[PDB]
Amino acid sequence: SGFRKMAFPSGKVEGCMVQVTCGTTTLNGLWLDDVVYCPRHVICTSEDMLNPNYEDLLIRKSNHNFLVQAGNVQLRVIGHSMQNCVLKLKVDTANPKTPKYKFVRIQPGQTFSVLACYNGSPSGVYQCAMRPNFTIKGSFLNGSCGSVGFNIDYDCVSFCYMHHMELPTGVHAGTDLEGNFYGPFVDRQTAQAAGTDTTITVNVLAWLYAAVINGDRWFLNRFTTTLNDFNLVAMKYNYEPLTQDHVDILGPLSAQTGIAVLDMCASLKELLQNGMNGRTILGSALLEDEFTPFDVVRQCSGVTFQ
Amino acid sequence: SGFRKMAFPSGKVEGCMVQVTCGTTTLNGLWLDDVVYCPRHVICTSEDMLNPNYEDLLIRKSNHNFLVQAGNVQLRVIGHSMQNCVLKLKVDTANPKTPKYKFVRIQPGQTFSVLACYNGSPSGVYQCAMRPNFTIKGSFLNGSCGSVGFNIDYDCVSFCYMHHMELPTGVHAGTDLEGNFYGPFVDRQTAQAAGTDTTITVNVLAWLYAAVINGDRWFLNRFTTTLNDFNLVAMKYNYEPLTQDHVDILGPLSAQTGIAVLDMCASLKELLQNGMNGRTILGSALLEDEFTPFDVVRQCSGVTFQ
Ligand SMILES: FC(F)(F)c1cc(-c2ccncc2)[nH]n1
Ligand SMILES: [Cl-]
Ligand code: NA
Ligand code: NA
Numbered sequence: 001s002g003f004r005k006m007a008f009p010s011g012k013v014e015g016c017m018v019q020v021t022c023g024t025t026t027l028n029g030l031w032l033d034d035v036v037y038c039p040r041h042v043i044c045t046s047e048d049m050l051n052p053n054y055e056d057l058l059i060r061k062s063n064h065n066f067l068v069q070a071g072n073v074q075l076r077v078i079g080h081s082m083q084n085c086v087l088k089l090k091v092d093t094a095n096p097k098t099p100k101y102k103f104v105r106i107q108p109g110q111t112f113s114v115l116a117c118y119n120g121s122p123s124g125v126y127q128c129a130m131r132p133n134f135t136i137k138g139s140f141l142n143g144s145c146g147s148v149g150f151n152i153d154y155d156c157v158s159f160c161y162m163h164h165m166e167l168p169t170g171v172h173a174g175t176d177l178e179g180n181f182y183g184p185f186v187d188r189q190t191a192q193a194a195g196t197d198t199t200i201t202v203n204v205l206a207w208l209y210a211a212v213i214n215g216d217r218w219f220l221n222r223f224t225t226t227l228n229d230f231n232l233v234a235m236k237y238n239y240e241p242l243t244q245d246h247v248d249i250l251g252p253l254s255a256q257t258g259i260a261v262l263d264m265c266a267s268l269k270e271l272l273q274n275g276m277n278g279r280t281i282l283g284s285a286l287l288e289d290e291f292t293p294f295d296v297v298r299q300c301s302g303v304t305f306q
Numbered sequence: 307s308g309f310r311k312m313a314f315p316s317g318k319v320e321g322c323m324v325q326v327t328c329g330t331t332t333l334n335g336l337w338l339d340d341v342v343y344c345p346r347h348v349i350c351t352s353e354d355m356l357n358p359n360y361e362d363l364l365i366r367k368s369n370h371n372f373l374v375q376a377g378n379v380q381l382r383v384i385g386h387s388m389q390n391c392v393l394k395l396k397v398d399t400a401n402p403k404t405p406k407y408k409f410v411r412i413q414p415g416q417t418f419s420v421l422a423c424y425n426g427s428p429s430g431v432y433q434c435a436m437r438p439n440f441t442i443k444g445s446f447l448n449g450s451c452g453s454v455g456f457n458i459d460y461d462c463v464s465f466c467y468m469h470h471m472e473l474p475t476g477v478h479a480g481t482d483l484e485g486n487f488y489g490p491f492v493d494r495q496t497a498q499a500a501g502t503d504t505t506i507t508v509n510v511l512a513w514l515y516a517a518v519i520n521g522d523r524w525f526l527n528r529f530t531t532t533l534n535d536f537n538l539v540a541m542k543y544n545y546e547p548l549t550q551d552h553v554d555i556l557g558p559l560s561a562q563t564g565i566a567v568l569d570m571c572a573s574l575k576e577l578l579q580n581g582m583n584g585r586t587i588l589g590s591a592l593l594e595d596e597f598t599p600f601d602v603v604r605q606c607s608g609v610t611f612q
Contacts, residue, residue, distance in 0.1 A: 002443060004445040006432045007432070011321065124605070126310040126311065139309055139312060171308070215476070305428060
């Protein structure tokens with residue numbers, strides 16, 4: 001029993017973290033096969049950041065301008081190029097610890113583990129969701145750029161996030177490993193803001209199912225509803241629309257717990273309209289939306305990643 | 307910015323997890339140098355649950371009764387001995403992945419990371435705290451016994467918990483790595499129940515300091531309190547006593563934020579009286595008690611956001 005915000009074991013990714021220095025700027029890089037990936041803004045001075053021309057800034061750099069340290073061992077950079085907003089540093093040795101991996105771009109609502117890193121050295125791991133407004137509510141300090149986010153699907157590490165910047169509200173923005181930003185953000189020191197966020201409805205439902213599985217049942221009721229009725233309520237309370245595909249995905253959990261999705265939706269409707277009346281669910285006084293249906297199934301079944 | 311429940315990177319512990327089988331029972335072992343540590347109750351049978359005599363059960367075992375699998379590899383058991391409630395299996399291979407490590411017994415309120423494992427293979431990582439009633443609120447399924455809790459200071463892993471059992475309330479009990487149980491529990495299936503749990507006051511205070519460091523001041527007030535009046539109030543809310551040790555411990559956070567410890571105590575008293583009135587603190591609608599003063603300093607900036 002029990003249900004905790006759980007990250008993937010981070011060992012396979014720790015073996016890929018390196019330190020990248022260019023001029024006075026040090027940040028983190030991801031070392032896979034013979035390439036080190038890091039944010040292209042590593043080449044900018046402070047005034048460069050105000051309005052960077054990245055191709056122009058890069059041509060002035062030689063390979064020896066990029067100092068890369070894997071542990072206490074230096075790596076020899078033998079080539080460099082840009083792909084969208086990530087710099088690719090070709091090195092002279094393949095990473096002997098390279099895991100089985102893919103680069104994948106995730107959808108808002110999906111979760112991933114972040115390996116927070118400083119000076120190429122992993123410092124912590126935590127679980128995040130890509131918010132509907134394409135930010136993440138991370139925890140990062142200066143020096144954390146180039147830290148990465150990932151899932152493990154069977155034995156393959158799926159890399160989905162590289163950290164680039166913090167927005168004025170304290171939430172965070174970055175790219176996939178092909179350098180495409182999540183959200184309408186640019187890697188430049190200019191005025192940028194998180195858009196208004198919404199709650200991930202299918203994840204809240206998944207977490208209610210997790211609650212029921214763990215004996216927390218007070219919010220269940222006799223009522224059911226319809227998609228169109230419930231989605232009217234969701235829109236009123238700034239919840240994402242629930243689609244038929246979400247209902248299908250929650251299917252397993254509906255049959256296991258005996259609570260149909262629209263039955264559970266009636267529970268969520270009543271919670272949104274009346275609150276919790278002093279009670280908690282899985283130890284929380286707010287409705288939690290950073291567990292996907294797959295997260296709930298996996299934690300409540302013990303899937304492993306050796 | 308940001309503030310998240312953050313675990314240590316697990317890789318150094320992942321490289322130590324093995325599977326231990328005895329009879330029909332399989333669970334996890336921790337492989338360090340040439341010793342594998344696991345719960346002694348792996349040698350119990352179905353009729354041994356209530357009043358096992360471990361000394362009598364163990365004397366009947368030979369080294370080849372213990373099967374230890376590390377990855378795809380059988381390790382050879384060349385010796386065994388029992389220390390309190392843990393079994394130490396001597397094996398014919400030192401673990402080449404053994405980190406710098408030590409064994410530390412922790413006090414209630416301390417936090418640590420848990421690497422949940424099944425069949426010797428890691429499933430997930432999360433953060434826990436040793437409750438005042440000597441249980442932990444974990445996420446553990448059948449087969450998770452032998453999973454460990456740890457901190458990582460510099461590059462050194464301090465092992466502080468090994469999981470032995472789940473109590474009827476769904477919380478968890480276990481030992482240090484010397485096999486001594488936390489709290490009054492025993493590795494028997496006789497009726498035992500956790501004491502009434504209380505809130506870790508010094509940790510709530512730490513987390514309020516984290517909220518100020520990250521720029522939130524809404525809950526402060528113009529008042530202060532004596533230590534004794536605070537404790538008289540807080541105990542009525544099932545909060546642990548705050549000692550002068552705790553006040554001393556909070557000195558650094560107090561100095562960083564400019565809020566005297568006893569002034570922060572006055573804020574907490576008011577929060578217990580008023581609730582949050584629809585507001586949140588670091589994203590929670592409840593007061594969080596599983597961040598220590600040491601945790602806050604490690605995760606937060608050294609510069610307060612005024
Ligand atoms: F044997 C049972 F009854 F199937 C079983 C035991 C556990 C468990 C849960 C958490 N920690 C340790 C063990 N789950 N289920
Ligand atoms: Cl109805
Ligand atoms: Na219902
Ligand atoms: Na293993």
